[PDB]
């Protein structure tokens, strides 16, 4: 079983610019572990598999959260640290194009459809239970949990938004944008590390190590 109520409860329980962005990311990594443990059945998975899932998904999971958080923000994002980062500040820091991708492909789409917190929570749980993650001891178990999440989300959408029959598909179709943006932000982080001017804290550093 995978009730959306527990997923929603998980979301509610955890509620230059590049430097400030990296601080927030590190900060939210601690919070993410807490979120994942509150997602039904995650803690019962083998510890090694919990490690694989969080290492595979952390970036996408964190991007989804700050994007939804930014829905009331005009042309900007709200960091978990309380900092509002505007589009102009991103451009003038050399990361304008990727910043705009987040705004147009994620934040704005979440805003235009009024994506709610149960929906965000489900999409994140789906991202968490990624059966393509390399090294898993039982991908079939993870797949099964993913299927349960999206069965519940679909039922939740049919019930809460019956006048929007395409809503469920619309939600799932933000996941390719998220994947792509996650991979681009990670590329940037590796570069910030390489150049060596940007402070990168310990949990963020550990995510950047090889498996």
């Amino acid at each position: 079983d995978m009730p959306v109520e527990r997923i929603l409860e998980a979301e509610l329980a955890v509620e230059d610019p590049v430097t400030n962005i990296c601080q927030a990311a590190d900060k939210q990594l601690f919070t993410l572990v807490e979120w994942a443990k509150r997602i039904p059945h995650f803690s019962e998975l083998p510890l090694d598999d919990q490690v694989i899932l969080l290492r595979a998904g952390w970036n996408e999971l964190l991007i989804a959260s700050f994007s939804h958080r930014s829905i009331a923000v005009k042309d900007g994002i709200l960091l978990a640290t309380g900092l509002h980062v505007h589009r102009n500040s991103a451009h003038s820091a050399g990361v304008g194009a990727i910043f705009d991708r987040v705004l147009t492909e994620l934040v704005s789409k979440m805003r235009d459809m009024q994506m709610d917190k149960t929906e965000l929570g489900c999409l994140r749980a789906i991202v968490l239970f990624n059966p393509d993650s390399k090294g898993l001891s039982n991908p079939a178990e993870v797949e099964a949990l993913r299927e349960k999440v999206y069965a519940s989300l679909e039922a939740y959408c049919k019930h809460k938004y019956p006048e929007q029959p395409g809503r469920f598909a619309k939600l799932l179709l933000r996941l390719p944008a998220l994947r792509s943006i996650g991979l681009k932000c990670l590329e940037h982080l590796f570069f910030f590390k390489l150049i060596g001017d940007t402070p990168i804290d310990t949990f963020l550093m550990e995510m950047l190590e090889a498996p």
Partner: peptide, 10 residues
């Protein structure tokens, strides 16, 4: 991956 292991442990 010491930090993650430690936090998942509890």
């Amino acid at each position: 991956h010491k930090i993650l292991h430690r936090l998942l442990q509890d």
